[PDB]
Short mmCIF file of C-alpha atoms in Angstrom, two decimals:
data_model
loop_
_atom_site.label_atom_id
_atom_site.label_comp_id
_atom_site.label_asym_id
_atom_site.label_seq_id
_atom_site.Cartn_x
_atom_site.Cartn_y
_atom_site.Cartn_z
CA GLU L 1 25.70 -55.62 -18.68
CA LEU L 2 27.33 -52.74 -20.48
CA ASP L 3 29.98 -53.26 -23.30
CA UNK L 4 33.62 -53.03 -22.81
CA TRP L 5 33.79 -49.41 -24.43
CA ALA L 6 30.48 -48.10 -22.93
CA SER L 7 30.03 -45.10 -20.51
CA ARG Z 1 45.58 -56.54 -44.32
CA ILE Z 2 43.36 -58.46 -42.02
CA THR Z 3 42.36 -62.04 -42.82
CA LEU Z 4 40.58 -64.62 -40.69
CA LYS Z 5 39.84 -68.33 -41.26
CA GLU Z 6 37.75 -70.89 -39.38
CA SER Z 7 38.86 -74.64 -39.10
CA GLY Z 8 37.41 -77.76 -37.31
CA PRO Z 9 35.40 -80.87 -37.93
CA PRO Z 10 32.63 -80.58 -40.72
CA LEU Z 11 30.65 -83.37 -38.87
CA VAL Z 12 30.16 -83.76 -35.24
CA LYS Z 13 27.65 -86.29 -33.22
CA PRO Z 14 25.24 -85.17 -30.66
CA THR Z 15 26.50 -85.10 -26.94
CA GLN Z 16 30.03 -84.66 -28.36
CA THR Z 17 32.41 -81.53 -27.99
CA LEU Z 18 32.92 -79.24 -30.99
CA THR Z 19 36.40 -77.42 -31.08
CA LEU Z 20 36.67 -74.61 -33.56
CA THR Z 21 39.81 -72.68 -34.43
CA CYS Z 22 40.04 -69.02 -35.84
CA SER Z 23 43.54 -68.58 -37.59
CA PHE Z 24 44.27 -64.98 -38.29
CA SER Z 25 46.77 -62.54 -39.73
CA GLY Z 26 46.97 -58.74 -39.98
CA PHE Z 27 46.58 -58.07 -36.30
CA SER Z 28 48.00 -59.46 -32.95
CA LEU Z 29 45.73 -60.34 -29.96
CA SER Z 30 48.44 -58.50 -28.09
CA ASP Z 31 47.34 -55.06 -29.70
CA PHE Z 32 45.39 -52.64 -27.58
CA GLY Z 33 41.69 -53.11 -27.57
CA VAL Z 34 41.37 -55.72 -30.12
CA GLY Z 35 38.73 -58.26 -30.02
CA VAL Z 36 37.80 -61.67 -31.64
CA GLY Z 37 34.33 -62.78 -31.67
CA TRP Z 38 32.33 -65.83 -32.94
CA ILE Z 39 28.91 -65.70 -34.62
CA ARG Z 40 26.78 -68.47 -36.03
CA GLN Z 41 24.11 -68.78 -38.76
CA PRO Z 42 21.85 -71.87 -38.90
CA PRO Z 43 20.64 -72.73 -42.48
CA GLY Z 44 18.29 -70.02 -43.74
CA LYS Z 45 18.06 -68.21 -40.36
CA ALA Z 46 19.57 -65.09 -38.63
CA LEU Z 47 22.89 -64.38 -37.27
CA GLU Z 48 23.47 -65.28 -33.65
CA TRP Z 49 26.09 -63.64 -31.41
CA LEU Z 50 28.14 -66.28 -29.51
CA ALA Z 51 31.24 -64.88 -27.57
CA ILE Z 52 34.23 -62.60 -27.83
CA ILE Z 53 37.63 -62.31 -26.36
CA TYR Z 54 39.81 -59.35 -26.04
CA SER Z 55 43.63 -58.74 -25.83
CA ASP Z 56 43.63 -58.33 -21.99
CA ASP Z 57 42.04 -61.86 -21.94
CA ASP Z 58 38.43 -60.59 -20.76
CA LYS Z 59 35.89 -62.93 -22.17
CA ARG Z 60 32.03 -62.72 -22.65
CA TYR Z 61 29.52 -65.23 -23.64
CA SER Z 62 25.94 -65.51 -24.87
CA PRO Z 63 23.81 -66.17 -21.76
CA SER Z 64 21.91 -68.70 -23.71
CA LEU Z 65 25.13 -70.75 -24.34
CA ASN Z 66 27.29 -69.83 -21.46
CA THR Z 67 27.47 -73.37 -19.95
CA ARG Z 68 28.39 -75.02 -23.01
CA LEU Z 69 30.78 -72.39 -24.36
CA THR Z 70 34.62 -71.77 -23.72
CA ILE Z 71 36.64 -69.24 -25.67
CA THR Z 72 40.41 -69.06 -25.49
CA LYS Z 73 43.37 -67.26 -27.16
CA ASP Z 74 46.77 -68.28 -28.31
CA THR Z 75 48.48 -65.04 -28.93
CA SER Z 76 51.76 -66.47 -30.05
CA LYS Z 77 50.10 -68.76 -32.88
CA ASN Z 78 47.59 -66.03 -33.83
CA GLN Z 79 44.53 -68.12 -32.94
CA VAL Z 80 41.31 -68.06 -31.08
CA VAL Z 81 39.49 -71.33 -30.12
CA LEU Z 82 35.81 -71.94 -29.41
CA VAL Z 83 34.98 -75.10 -27.46
CA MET Z 84 31.17 -75.97 -27.41
CA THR Z 85 30.23 -79.13 -25.32
CA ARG Z 86 27.18 -81.25 -25.33
CA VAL Z 87 26.15 -80.53 -29.02
CA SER Z 88 22.79 -81.26 -30.35
CA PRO Z 89 21.07 -80.90 -33.82
CA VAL Z 90 20.13 -77.24 -33.35
CA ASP Z 91 23.81 -76.30 -33.35
CA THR Z 92 23.97 -77.35 -37.11
CA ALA Z 93 25.14 -73.80 -38.46
CA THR Z 94 27.95 -71.99 -40.42
CA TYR Z 95 30.26 -70.60 -37.78
CA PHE Z 96 32.13 -67.33 -38.36
CA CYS Z 97 34.94 -65.69 -36.30
CA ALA Z 98 35.51 -61.89 -36.68
CA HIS Z 99 37.63 -59.07 -35.86
CA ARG Z 100 36.76 -55.98 -33.60
CA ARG Z 101 38.80 -52.98 -33.89
CA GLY Z 102 40.07 -51.11 -30.75
CA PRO Z 103 39.77 -47.34 -30.30
CA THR Z 104 41.69 -44.92 -32.75
CA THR Z 105 44.72 -43.78 -31.06
CA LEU Z 106 46.89 -40.63 -31.26
CA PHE Z 107 50.46 -41.16 -30.07
CA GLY Z 108 49.24 -44.47 -28.27
CA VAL Z 109 46.37 -42.47 -26.54
CA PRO Z 110 42.74 -43.42 -27.32
CA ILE Z 111 40.83 -40.40 -28.90
CA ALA Z 112 37.91 -42.16 -30.72
CA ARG Z 113 35.78 -45.11 -29.46
CA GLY Z 114 33.68 -45.06 -32.57
CA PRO Z 115 35.38 -47.77 -34.53
CA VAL Z 116 34.84 -50.44 -31.94
CA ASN Z 117 31.16 -50.45 -32.77
CA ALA Z 118 31.16 -53.15 -35.23
CA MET Z 119 32.86 -56.38 -36.26
CA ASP Z 120 34.89 -55.23 -39.34
CA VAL Z 121 36.41 -58.29 -40.96
CA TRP Z 122 34.94 -61.73 -41.11
CA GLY Z 123 36.15 -65.07 -42.02
CA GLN Z 124 34.45 -67.18 -44.83
CA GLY Z 125 32.71 -69.45 -42.21
CA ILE Z 126 33.00 -73.08 -41.48
CA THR Z 127 29.86 -75.31 -42.13
CA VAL Z 128 29.38 -77.63 -39.20
CA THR Z 129 26.69 -80.56 -39.32
CA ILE Z 130 25.38 -82.18 -36.06
CA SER Z 131 24.03 -85.82 -36.76
CA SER Z 132 24.48 -89.22 -35.22
CA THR Z 133 24.14 -90.93 -38.52
CA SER Z 134 26.90 -92.40 -40.80
CA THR Z 135 27.21 -92.29 -44.48
CA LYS Z 136 24.09 -93.60 -46.26
CA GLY Z 137 22.81 -93.53 -49.87
CA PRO Z 138 19.31 -92.22 -50.72
CA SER Z 139 16.14 -94.01 -51.52
CA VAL Z 140 14.57 -92.50 -54.74
CA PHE Z 141 10.74 -92.29 -55.05
CA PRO Z 142 8.62 -91.00 -57.78
CA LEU Z 143 6.49 -87.88 -57.66
CA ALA Z 144 3.79 -88.44 -60.13
CA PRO Z 145 0.74 -86.03 -60.40
CA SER Z 146 -2.49 -87.75 -61.59
CA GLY Z 153 -2.22 -75.35 -67.07
CA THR Z 154 1.26 -76.96 -66.66
CA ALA Z 155 1.99 -80.51 -65.44
CA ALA Z 156 4.40 -81.29 -62.66
CA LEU Z 157 6.56 -84.34 -61.76
CA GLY Z 158 9.66 -85.14 -59.66
CA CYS Z 159 11.75 -87.21 -57.44
CA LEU Z 160 11.87 -87.56 -53.83
CA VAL Z 161 15.58 -88.19 -52.92
CA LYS Z 162 15.05 -89.42 -49.36
CA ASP Z 163 17.24 -90.62 -46.45
CA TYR Z 164 20.66 -89.76 -47.16
CA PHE Z 165 23.96 -88.74 -45.35
CA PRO Z 166 25.91 -86.42 -45.61
CA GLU Z 167 25.48 -83.47 -48.19
CA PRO Z 168 25.60 -83.05 -51.13
CA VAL Z 169 23.54 -84.95 -53.73
CA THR Z 170 23.39 -83.96 -57.37
CA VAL Z 171 20.21 -84.28 -59.37
CA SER Z 172 19.77 -83.63 -63.09
CA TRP Z 173 16.98 -84.37 -65.48
CA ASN Z 174 17.35 -86.59 -68.73
CA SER Z 175 21.08 -86.84 -68.38
CA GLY Z 176 21.44 -82.93 -68.23
CA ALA Z 177 19.19 -82.37 -71.39
CA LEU Z 178 16.32 -80.96 -69.35
CA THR Z 179 16.90 -77.75 -67.41
CA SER Z 180 13.74 -75.49 -68.23
CA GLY Z 181 11.30 -75.53 -65.41
CA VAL Z 182 13.44 -77.57 -63.09
CA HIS Z 183 13.46 -76.77 -59.50
CA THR Z 184 15.84 -78.80 -57.12
CA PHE Z 185 15.01 -77.77 -53.64
CA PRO Z 186 17.59 -77.30 -50.78
CA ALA Z 187 17.73 -80.47 -48.57
CA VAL Z 188 16.10 -80.50 -45.11
CA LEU Z 189 17.93 -82.07 -42.10
CA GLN Z 190 15.12 -84.58 -40.80
CA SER Z 191 14.92 -85.32 -37.05
CA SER Z 192 16.32 -88.82 -37.68
CA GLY Z 193 19.77 -87.01 -38.80
CA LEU Z 194 19.28 -87.89 -42.45
CA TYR Z 195 18.69 -85.38 -45.30
CA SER Z 196 15.81 -85.40 -47.63
CA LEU Z 197 14.92 -83.14 -50.80
CA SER Z 198 12.77 -83.20 -53.76
CA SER Z 199 13.58 -82.15 -57.41
CA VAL Z 200 10.75 -81.35 -59.61
CA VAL Z 201 10.03 -80.05 -63.05
CA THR Z 202 6.98 -78.23 -64.81
CA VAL Z 203 6.47 -79.35 -68.45
CA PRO Z 204 3.65 -78.72 -71.07
CA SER Z 205 0.66 -81.07 -70.19
CA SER Z 206 0.81 -82.21 -73.67
CA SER Z 207 4.33 -83.40 -73.44
CA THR Z 210 5.76 -87.07 -76.22
CA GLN Z 211 8.85 -86.89 -73.81
CA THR Z 212 10.27 -89.39 -71.29
CA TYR Z 213 11.28 -87.96 -67.91
CA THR Z 214 14.09 -89.44 -65.81
CA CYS Z 215 15.99 -87.99 -62.74
CA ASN Z 216 19.71 -88.70 -62.47
CA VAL Z 217 20.56 -88.86 -58.78
CA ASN Z 218 24.16 -89.09 -57.60
CA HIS Z 219 25.23 -89.21 -53.95
CA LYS Z 220 29.07 -89.14 -54.11
CA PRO Z 221 29.85 -89.94 -50.43
CA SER Z 222 28.22 -93.47 -50.48
CA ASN Z 223 28.74 -94.34 -54.21
CA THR Z 224 24.92 -94.27 -54.96
CA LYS Z 225 23.96 -93.28 -58.60
CA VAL Z 226 20.27 -93.85 -59.33
CA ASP Z 227 18.30 -93.09 -62.65
CA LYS Z 228 14.44 -93.16 -62.10
CA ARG Z 229 12.11 -92.70 -64.85
CA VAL Z 230 8.92 -90.88 -63.62
CA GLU Z 231 5.83 -91.38 -65.97
CA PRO Z 232 2.12 -90.26 -65.17
CA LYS Z 233 0.20 -92.88 -62.99
CA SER Z 234 -1.70 -95.64 -64.36
CA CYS Z 235 0.54 -98.20 -66.15
CA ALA P 1 17.28 -59.63 -22.71
CA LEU P 2 17.65 -56.71 -25.48
CA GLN P 3 15.78 -57.33 -28.61
CA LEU P 4 16.57 -55.82 -32.04
CA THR P 5 13.76 -55.56 -34.39
CA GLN P 6 14.10 -55.19 -38.14
CA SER P 7 11.50 -53.65 -40.16
CA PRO P 8 10.36 -54.72 -42.88
CA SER P 9 11.59 -58.50 -42.72
CA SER P 10 11.25 -58.72 -46.54
CA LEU P 11 11.49 -55.90 -49.11
CA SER P 12 11.01 -55.73 -52.86
CA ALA P 13 12.78 -53.24 -55.11
CA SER P 14 14.29 -52.68 -58.44
CA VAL P 15 17.70 -51.29 -59.58
CA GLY P 16 17.97 -47.56 -59.22
CA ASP P 17 15.47 -47.32 -56.15
CA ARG P 18 16.03 -45.71 -52.89
CA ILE P 19 15.39 -48.03 -50.01
CA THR P 20 15.30 -47.67 -46.18
CA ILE P 21 15.67 -50.41 -43.63
CA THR P 22 14.98 -49.76 -40.07
CA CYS P 23 16.35 -51.36 -36.86
CA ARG P 24 14.55 -50.61 -33.55
CA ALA P 25 16.16 -51.60 -30.13
CA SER P 26 13.97 -52.47 -27.01
CA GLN P 27 16.40 -50.19 -24.84
CA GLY P 28 18.64 -47.37 -25.77
CA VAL P 29 21.96 -48.37 -27.35
CA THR P 30 23.42 -45.05 -28.01
CA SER P 31 25.37 -45.01 -31.28
CA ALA P 32 26.56 -48.53 -30.89
CA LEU P 33 25.05 -50.18 -33.93
CA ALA P 34 26.39 -51.51 -37.05
CA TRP P 35 24.98 -52.47 -40.55
CA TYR P 36 25.93 -55.53 -42.54
CA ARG P 37 25.16 -56.93 -46.07
CA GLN P 38 25.24 -60.72 -46.67
CA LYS P 39 25.29 -62.07 -50.07
CA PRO P 40 24.31 -65.65 -50.56
CA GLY P 41 26.93 -68.16 -49.72
CA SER P 42 29.29 -65.29 -48.30
CA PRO P 43 30.03 -63.92 -44.90
CA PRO P 44 28.47 -60.65 -43.67
CA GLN P 45 30.40 -57.46 -44.85
CA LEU P 46 30.38 -54.32 -42.65
CA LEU P 47 28.80 -51.42 -44.24
CA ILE P 48 28.17 -48.80 -41.47
CA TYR P 49 29.82 -48.70 -37.92
CA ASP P 50 29.01 -46.45 -35.02
CA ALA P 51 25.29 -45.80 -36.39
CA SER P 52 26.46 -43.40 -39.17
CA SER P 53 30.16 -43.87 -39.97
CA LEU P 54 30.94 -45.06 -43.47
CA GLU P 55 33.22 -48.04 -43.48
CA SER P 56 36.34 -47.61 -45.64
CA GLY P 57 35.98 -49.14 -49.20
CA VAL P 58 32.16 -49.43 -48.86
CA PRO P 59 30.40 -47.43 -51.72
CA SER P 60 28.88 -44.09 -51.10
CA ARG P 61 25.17 -45.09 -51.68
CA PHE P 62 25.19 -46.65 -48.30
CA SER P 63 24.31 -44.52 -45.28
CA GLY P 64 23.12 -45.07 -41.77
CA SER P 65 21.50 -42.55 -39.31
CA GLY P 66 19.80 -42.73 -36.04
CA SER P 67 20.67 -43.02 -32.21
CA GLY P 68 19.36 -44.64 -29.16
CA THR P 69 16.27 -46.86 -30.21
CA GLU P 70 15.72 -45.77 -33.81
CA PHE P 71 18.20 -46.60 -36.62
CA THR P 72 17.82 -46.55 -40.36
CA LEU P 73 19.97 -47.82 -43.39
CA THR P 74 19.45 -46.15 -46.64
CA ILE P 75 20.69 -47.21 -50.09
CA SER P 76 20.44 -44.45 -52.58
CA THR P 77 20.21 -46.02 -56.04
CA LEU P 78 20.10 -49.72 -55.54
CA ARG P 79 22.68 -51.68 -57.49
CA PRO P 80 22.32 -55.31 -58.64
CA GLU P 81 24.69 -56.47 -55.82
CA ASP P 82 22.58 -55.13 -53.23
CA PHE P 83 19.90 -57.77 -53.67
CA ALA P 84 20.94 -59.67 -50.29
CA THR P 85 20.05 -59.86 -46.80
CA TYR P 86 20.88 -57.14 -44.22
CA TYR P 87 21.55 -57.19 -40.58
CA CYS P 88 21.82 -54.74 -37.77
CA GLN P 89 24.00 -55.21 -34.62
CA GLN P 90 23.92 -53.72 -31.36
CA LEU P 91 27.31 -53.45 -29.33
CA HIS P 92 26.25 -51.23 -26.34
CA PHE P 93 25.28 -54.38 -24.20
CA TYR P 94 26.49 -57.83 -23.73
CA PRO P 95 25.34 -60.15 -25.56
CA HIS P 96 26.01 -58.13 -28.83
CA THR P 97 22.51 -59.07 -30.34
CA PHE P 98 21.86 -59.17 -34.19
CA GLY P 99 18.60 -58.32 -35.72
CA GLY P 100 16.32 -60.82 -37.58
CA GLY P 101 17.56 -59.60 -41.06
CA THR P 102 15.79 -57.90 -43.97
CA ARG P 103 15.75 -59.77 -47.29
CA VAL P 104 15.85 -57.33 -50.41
CA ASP P 105 14.89 -59.09 -53.68
CA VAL P 106 13.95 -58.34 -57.17
CA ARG P 107 10.43 -56.91 -57.63
CA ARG P 108 8.11 -58.21 -60.30
CA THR P 109 4.32 -58.54 -60.71
CA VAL P 110 2.39 -60.54 -58.12
CA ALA P 111 2.20 -64.33 -59.32
CA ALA P 112 -0.05 -67.01 -57.72
CA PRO P 113 1.57 -70.45 -57.00
CA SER P 114 0.55 -73.35 -59.16
CA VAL P 115 -0.23 -75.79 -56.61
CA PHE P 116 0.35 -79.63 -57.00
CA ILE P 117 -0.10 -82.45 -54.43
CA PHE P 118 1.98 -85.72 -54.79
CA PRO P 119 0.62 -89.01 -53.12
CA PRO P 120 3.35 -91.40 -51.72
CA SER P 121 4.56 -94.01 -54.00
CA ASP P 122 3.71 -97.92 -53.62
CA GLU P 123 7.57 -98.27 -53.65
CA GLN P 124 7.88 -96.02 -50.46
CA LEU P 125 4.75 -97.63 -48.74
CA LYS P 126 6.72 -101.04 -49.05
CA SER P 127 9.38 -99.70 -46.86
CA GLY P 128 6.99 -98.51 -44.01
CA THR P 129 6.86 -94.90 -44.38
CA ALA P 130 4.72 -92.34 -46.27
CA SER P 131 5.87 -88.98 -47.61
CA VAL P 132 3.05 -86.78 -49.11
CA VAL P 133 4.48 -83.70 -50.97
CA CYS P 134 2.92 -80.33 -52.00
CA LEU P 135 4.46 -78.13 -54.53
CA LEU P 136 3.98 -74.45 -54.92
CA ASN P 137 5.53 -73.55 -58.44
CA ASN P 138 6.58 -70.08 -59.47
CA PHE P 139 5.29 -67.40 -57.22
CA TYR P 140 5.84 -63.90 -55.91
CA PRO P 141 6.24 -62.40 -53.28
CA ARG P 142 8.11 -65.18 -51.15
CA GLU P 143 5.73 -65.27 -48.30
CA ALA P 144 3.28 -68.30 -48.54
CA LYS P 145 1.58 -70.49 -45.88
CA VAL P 146 1.07 -74.28 -46.37
CA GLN P 147 -1.39 -76.08 -44.03
CA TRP P 148 -1.75 -79.82 -44.21
CA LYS P 149 -5.20 -81.44 -43.52
CA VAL P 150 -5.70 -85.15 -43.10
CA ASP P 151 -9.39 -86.07 -42.77
CA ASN P 152 -10.13 -82.42 -42.14
CA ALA P 153 -7.71 -82.58 -39.18
CA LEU P 154 -4.93 -79.88 -38.91
CA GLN P 155 -1.40 -81.13 -38.97
CA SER P 156 1.66 -79.85 -37.24
CA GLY P 157 5.22 -80.99 -36.25
CA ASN P 158 5.06 -83.54 -39.08
CA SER P 159 6.13 -81.43 -42.04
CA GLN P 160 9.32 -79.77 -43.32
CA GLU P 161 9.53 -77.18 -46.13
CA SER P 162 12.23 -75.87 -48.39
CA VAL P 163 12.02 -72.69 -50.63
CA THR P 164 14.40 -72.23 -53.76
CA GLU P 165 16.36 -68.86 -54.24
CA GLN P 166 14.78 -66.35 -56.38
CA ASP P 167 15.07 -67.41 -59.99
CA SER P 168 17.74 -65.41 -62.08
CA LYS P 169 15.31 -64.71 -64.94
CA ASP P 170 11.82 -65.40 -63.73
CA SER P 171 12.36 -63.54 -60.42
CA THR P 172 9.91 -66.01 -58.66
CA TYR P 173 10.10 -68.64 -55.86
CA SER P 174 9.04 -72.25 -55.60
CA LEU P 175 8.35 -74.22 -52.35
CA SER P 176 8.15 -77.93 -51.59
CA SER P 177 6.48 -79.11 -48.28
CA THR P 178 6.67 -82.80 -47.29
CA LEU P 179 4.31 -84.45 -44.93
CA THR P 180 5.74 -87.62 -43.24
CA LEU P 181 3.57 -90.33 -41.79
CA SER P 182 4.22 -93.95 -40.96
CA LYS P 183 2.60 -96.54 -43.38
CA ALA P 184 0.14 -97.55 -40.54
CA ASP P 185 -1.04 -93.93 -39.89
CA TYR P 186 -1.29 -93.31 -43.51
CA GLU P 187 -3.61 -96.30 -44.01
CA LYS P 188 -6.00 -95.07 -41.26
CA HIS P 189 -7.01 -91.97 -43.28
CA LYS P 190 -8.42 -90.99 -46.74
CA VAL P 191 -8.47 -87.15 -47.39
CA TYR P 192 -5.02 -85.72 -47.80
CA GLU P 193 -5.21 -81.85 -48.36
CA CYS P 194 -2.56 -79.34 -48.96
CA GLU P 195 -4.21 -75.70 -48.20
CA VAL P 196 -2.17 -72.83 -49.81
CA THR P 197 -2.58 -69.26 -48.77
CA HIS P 198 -0.81 -66.60 -50.87
CA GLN P 199 -1.23 -62.84 -51.94
CA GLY P 200 -1.77 -63.86 -55.49
CA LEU P 201 -4.77 -65.90 -54.46
CA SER P 202 -8.11 -64.11 -53.64
CA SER P 203 -9.09 -67.17 -51.60
CA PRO P 204 -6.88 -70.14 -50.24
CA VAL P 205 -6.62 -72.92 -52.84
CA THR P 206 -6.69 -76.52 -51.71
CA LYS P 207 -5.19 -79.56 -53.56
CA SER P 208 -6.31 -82.97 -52.48
CA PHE P 209 -6.47 -86.62 -53.23
CA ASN P 210 -8.29 -89.51 -51.56
CA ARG P 211 -6.11 -92.51 -50.43
CA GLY P 212 -6.58 -95.70 -52.17
CA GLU P 213 -9.14 -94.30 -54.83
CA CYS P 214 -8.23 -96.11 -57.94
#
């Protein structure tokens, strides 16, 4: 899944 | 200034539980956005990501090791603990804990997420060895050949590291190659120590082996085969 | 999951050289990539964060560029402390995967290994085990392939090898490979061959002995 700081 | 240090058992037996502690200073695990991760490095191999825990207590694990790993934090003691269950010999590695920055803030408000894209400060690392065997001394065997000539000593079946090997009580250093030990499938270490000399050489060659953990000092004279 | 492929896996250079190391991701990772330098017996040290940002206290000669799937680390004017191993790390997806690493060593002229084969001692045979060792002495580059052959049969799973660190004055490497068999299995065969393939050899050199031949 996406990293904590992604998007 | 930020510093991290790993602590735990240097030796663990297969099927047992490994508890590693990352003690730190310079930051608090109550600071916004901060993370502390664990990374391992098996001897002579690449870095492998293990897990990370953040200030809000969110935890993430490597899918390959998920079932065996547990990460926790103790904010008051400035510590992060990684617990690895059911260890096997492939888990023999140097284990590092590392700091992850949170976003750059302006008046407490996050303005740049760029600094989070790295593990900025790392601990020295702790070397963990997984083997079922106990303290054992080496059996030293000669390596005799038959345009430089080669000869050596095979320091086989010992536990744990290290072992010191010198040639001619320290008088011979040129052309000497003491190879790093390999952990055999039996859980015991083994290495060779060789030396290349002029084929014409008059001189006597003796390897001085010393395995301090078991009090085993051996001096073996290696001469060409046939009497 | 996501794979980070580093290229080249090994690189040779001299002091003052401009080297570039590439890291390629299987899927787009935006700018979430970091570069580290690891010196022998030391932890990795951050060089570049967020693909191109220079970490504080890190020398100006280091620079990173690229976004998405293609990333590069360039060292302008290589210094002696740069002969180490370099790693890239992706931080856009969980797990935060690392690349395989790129070894940067001291360049010198191609040197072929002096190969030697060592039969097991009678002293070891008395304990019920037989260790046959092959030595590849003073070679360059690091890449070498050892292949054990017993009565023209290809061996696998019964050998372990070690390589020394680059020699400080010679700039060469040395390799030791140990073939381990039980005394019984050793006694059932005659020709023990150590086949070595290397860049410095035009054709693979074989060093052998016949068991019991006195």
